[PDB]
Design an enzyme around this catalytic site. Structure first.
Site, PDB file in Angstrom:
ATOM      1  N   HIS A  41       0.817  -1.210   0.000  1.00  6.54           N
ATOM      2  CA  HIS A  41       0.000   0.000   0.000  1.00  6.54           C
ATOM      3  C   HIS A  41       0.851   1.262   0.000  1.00  6.54           C
ATOM      4  CE1 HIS A  41       0.721   1.276   4.134  1.00  6.54           C
ATOM      5  NE2 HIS A  41       0.459   0.057   4.567  1.00  6.54           N
ATOM      6  N   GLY A 143       3.283   6.059   9.690  1.00  6.57           N
ATOM      7  CA  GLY A 143       4.663   5.810   9.352  1.00  6.57           C
ATOM      8  C   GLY A 143       5.241   4.561   9.984  1.00  6.57           C
ATOM      9  N   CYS A 145       4.231   1.716   9.526  1.00  6.82           N
ATOM     10  CA  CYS A 145       4.133   0.634   8.555  1.00  6.82           C
ATOM     11  C   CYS A 145       5.522   0.207   8.102  1.00  6.82           C
ATOM     12  CB  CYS A 145       3.297   1.072   7.353  1.00  6.82           C
ATOM     13  SG  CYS A 145       1.651   1.677   7.783  1.00  6.82           S
TER      14      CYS A 145
HETATM   15  C1  LIG Z   1      -0.598   7.623   3.086  1.00  9.84           C
HETATM   16  N1  LIG Z   1       0.118   6.952   4.165  1.00  9.84           N
HETATM   17  C2  LIG Z   1      -0.544   6.107   4.946  1.00  9.84           C
HETATM   18  C3  LIG Z   1       0.089   5.439   5.989  1.00  9.84           C
HETATM   19  C4  LIG Z   1      -0.770   4.486   6.839  1.00  9.84           C
HETATM   20  C5  LIG Z   1      -1.726   3.685   6.231  1.00  9.84           C
HETATM   21  C6  LIG Z   1      -2.503   2.832   7.007  1.00  9.84           C
HETATM   22  C7  LIG Z   1      -3.545   1.958   6.315  1.00  9.84           C
HETATM   23  C8  LIG Z   1      -3.177   1.119   5.267  1.00  9.84           C
HETATM   24  C9  LIG Z   1      -4.133   0.329   4.638  1.00  9.84           C
HETATM   25 CL1  LIG Z   1      -3.731  -0.768   3.297  1.00  9.84          CL
HETATM   26  C10 LIG Z   1      -5.450   0.378   5.050  1.00  9.84           C
HETATM   27  F1  LIG Z   1      -6.370  -0.404   4.421  1.00  9.84           F
HETATM   28  C11 LIG Z   1      -5.810   1.219   6.090  1.00  9.84           C
HETATM   29  O1  LIG Z   1      -7.128   1.279   6.523  1.00  9.84           O
HETATM   30  C12 LIG Z   1      -7.323   0.464   7.644  1.00  9.84           C
HETATM   31  C13 LIG Z   1      -8.755   0.678   8.102  1.00  9.84           C
HETATM   32  C14 LIG Z   1      -9.756  -0.111   7.562  1.00  9.84           C
HETATM   33  C15 LIG Z   1     -11.065   0.082   7.970  1.00  9.84           C
HETATM   34  C16 LIG Z   1     -11.362   1.062   8.911  1.00  9.84           C
HETATM   35  C17 LIG Z   1     -10.354   1.846   9.447  1.00  9.84           C
HETATM   36  C18 LIG Z   1      -9.045   1.660   9.043  1.00  9.84           C
HETATM   37 CL2  LIG Z   1      -7.758   2.682   9.741  1.00  9.84          CL
HETATM   38  C19 LIG Z   1      -4.864   2.009   6.725  1.00  9.84           C
HETATM   39  C20 LIG Z   1      -2.345   2.782   8.393  1.00  9.84           C
HETATM   40  O2  LIG Z   1      -3.027   2.037   9.091  1.00  9.84           O
HETATM   41  N2  LIG Z   1      -1.417   3.576   8.943  1.00  9.84           N
HETATM   42  C21 LIG Z   1      -1.192   3.582  10.375  1.00  9.84           C
HETATM   43  C22 LIG Z   1      -1.449   4.721  11.116  1.00  9.84           C
HETATM   44  C23 LIG Z   1      -1.216   4.678  12.485  1.00  9.84           C
HETATM   45  C24 LIG Z   1      -0.735   3.510  13.059  1.00  9.84           C
HETATM   46  N3  LIG Z   1      -0.497   2.429  12.321  1.00  9.84           N
HETATM   47  C25 LIG Z   1      -0.713   2.440  11.005  1.00  9.84           C
HETATM   48  C26 LIG Z   1      -0.658   4.399   8.215  1.00  9.84           C
HETATM   49  C27 LIG Z   1       1.456   5.687   6.184  1.00  9.84           C
HETATM   50  O3  LIG Z   1       2.110   5.150   7.074  1.00  9.84           O
HETATM   51  N4  LIG Z   1       2.066   6.553   5.356  1.00  9.84           N
HETATM   52  C28 LIG Z   1       1.420   7.180   4.362  1.00  9.84           C
HETATM   53  O4  LIG Z   1       2.012   7.933   3.663  1.00  9.84           O
END
Ligand SMILES: Cn1cc(-c2cc(-c3cc(Cl)c(F)c(OCc4ccccc4Cl)c3)c(=O)n(-c3cccnc3)c2)c(=O)[nH]c1=O
Ligand SMILES: Cn1cc(-c2cc(-c3cc(Cl)c(F)c(OCc4ccccc4Cl)c3)c(=O)n(-c3cccnc3)c2)c(=O)[nH]c1=O
Lengths: 300, 300
Positions: A41, A143, A145
């Protein structure tokens, strides 16, 4: 003397953590040999995360659109692929600090160590377990991730976890380094339930043997019980059923302590049925279950 | 999302841990620049540990009697001295992996990270605090001596602790890297009391602000209180008195959460006066106090 949630020493894995930037999205990656693993992702955008067609997105992308930075040195990407839900970026360099490593897929109840990262830089380390419903209760911000979970047998780092997402319930989900999600979770922002979370019955019995070794013996009693009777109590309360395998695992702890396993189970039942009355077992008013039988022997 | 007892990434300090053998006694040491620090009771024998005259013992010893092994490579000792309760072995080599480091002496309540070692080899890492009575509740077995406590500000490893001994009560005591014991403890096997251990009031208030950030807001109420009234309650229960300094430290957490500090204190009083009724704050049936206000911001 003493018992704490120890984590494996994190030196070996710190040297494998890199920054991985795609478009505006940035997240951590794992650099072993001449390959860089990271969640797929990374290639998603704001709109696409509702339901992304990763083939479509992966296709419009080319090697130069992937920016890998090992500390402060950029690596050249010369090949990209998708194994399950992870990206695998071929790079011109082979990490000089690649340890002996392995990709294992672990089972619910096994504990591992997390090296939480942001922009590929270590931030902290903590021990946690794989809940029976295949979620984890960790410490992750945006971040986080790409952060990895791992066990170190001696000189071999067995990687078992890669973080991907938080669920709306504050619980986290991830994959193995082959890309297979632990659980029924998908990497799209859609409705996904965690499921019924029970307690790791064996890890509690391992944590109770640890207490007799360290002086806390108040929870012991003169009762006994049958495997069947206990599980009936372990069903009323949501506890993973205890099996004979689980009893053989705890054998080493019984020979050290001179306490039959079924006599420990008899005290657990009373702790469940009557609570702790405000007491403490190794400084925990709750029955801890993130210590595997092996952990307790590792830490002695 | 999530909150856990994280420990600083241990990579930098692993590269400084060496084995130090004197006579039959072996214990860990810290190798920085061209000096090796280790506890001085390395030179004690079975009989001498009742009351050792360390000058007498240090005197009968010579540089070749000290065996320092950095992993699997032996270092040549070319100078020995005694600063307080630590030995300082000059060596011909300067550790290529010496990080930016510092020797700070911390104050009761400050948290640090421990890298537990045996025969100079990392075993595990965990976070813990300096109890107000200057003891620590750690995880130490025979050979754990010499293990270090440390904080990492960014690229500088501030060493604050060196482990020396377990007390008969299962609590541990140590020195700063200059050799000064934290507390009224001496390095001889004689009667030494720990003292009255209170709770780190400020670290609990920091741990409660962390809970409002992560969803657990059940402990909040519509009351308030005065600094004086709370401390009166913090004296009945054994809690370190809360000061205005302590309130300024928590300022950053109040601006994030929109909760006056004295309104958090008002909920703590109810948690003390009425208990938790079997509830949970971030998965702890006990009020945790090993999270400094800074820790909660570090981890967010
Ligand atoms: C653009 N972008 C995005 C992320 C990033 C993406 C995510 C993330 C990734 C995928 Cl595939 C998701 F399907 C997703 O929906 C999960 C969800 C499903 C249903 C209801 C609520 C939710 Cl929340 C979330 C994330 O969960 N986090 C995160 C945040 C806080 C702690 N842990 C993880 C971070 C990143 O790190 N950098 C960056 O640039
Ligand atoms: C020969 N020898 C000895 C040690 C070693 C020495 C000690 C140790 C060192 C000194 Cl100066 C002491 F005054 C001491 O009496 C503390 C005491 C005072 C009063 C009542 C009870 C007690 Cl216990 C103990 C130790 O406490 N531990 C340890 C063990 C378990 C966990 N943590 C620390 C280990 C070693 O590591 N290697 C090695 O060869």
């Amino acid at each position: 003397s003493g018992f704490r949630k120890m984590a494996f020493p994190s030196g070996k894995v710190e040297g494998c953590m890199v920054q991985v930037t795609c478009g505006t999205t940035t997240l951590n990656g794992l650099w072993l040999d001449d390959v860089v693993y990271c969640p797929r992702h990374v290639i998603c955008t704001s709109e696409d995360m509702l339901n992304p067609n990763y083939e479509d997105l992966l296709i419009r992308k080319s090697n130069h659109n992937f920016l890998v930075q090992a500390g402060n040195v950029q690596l050249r990407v010369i090949g990209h692929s998708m194994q399950n839900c992870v990206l695998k970026l071929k790079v011109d360099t082979a990490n000089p600090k690649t340890p002996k490593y392995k990709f294992v897929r672990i089972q619910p109840g096994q504990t591992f160590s997390v090296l939480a990262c942001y922009n590929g830089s270590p931030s902290g380390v903590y021990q946690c377990a794989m809940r029976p419903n295949f979620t984890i209760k960790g410490s992750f911000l945006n971040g986080s991730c790409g952060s990895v979970g791992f066990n170190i047998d001696y000189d071999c780092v067995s990687f078992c976890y890669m973080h991907h997402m938080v669920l709306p319930t504050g619980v986290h989900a991830g994959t193995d380094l082959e890309g297979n999600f632990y659980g029924p979770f998908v990497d799209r922002q859609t409705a996904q339930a965690a499921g019924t979370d029970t307690t790791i019955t064996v890890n509690v019995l391992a944590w109770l043997y640890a207490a007799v070794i360290n002086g806390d013996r108040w929870f012991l009693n003169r009762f006994t019980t049958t495997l069947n009777d206990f599980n009936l109590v372990a069903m009323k309360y949501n506890y993973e059923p205890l099996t004979q395998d689980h009893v053989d695992i705890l054998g080493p702890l019984s020979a050290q302590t001179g306490i039959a396993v079924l006599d420990m189970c008899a005290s657990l039942k009373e702790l469940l049925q009557n609570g702790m009355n405000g007491r403490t077992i190794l400084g925990s008013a709750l029955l801890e279950d993130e210590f595997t039988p092996f952990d307790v022997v590792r830490q002695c």
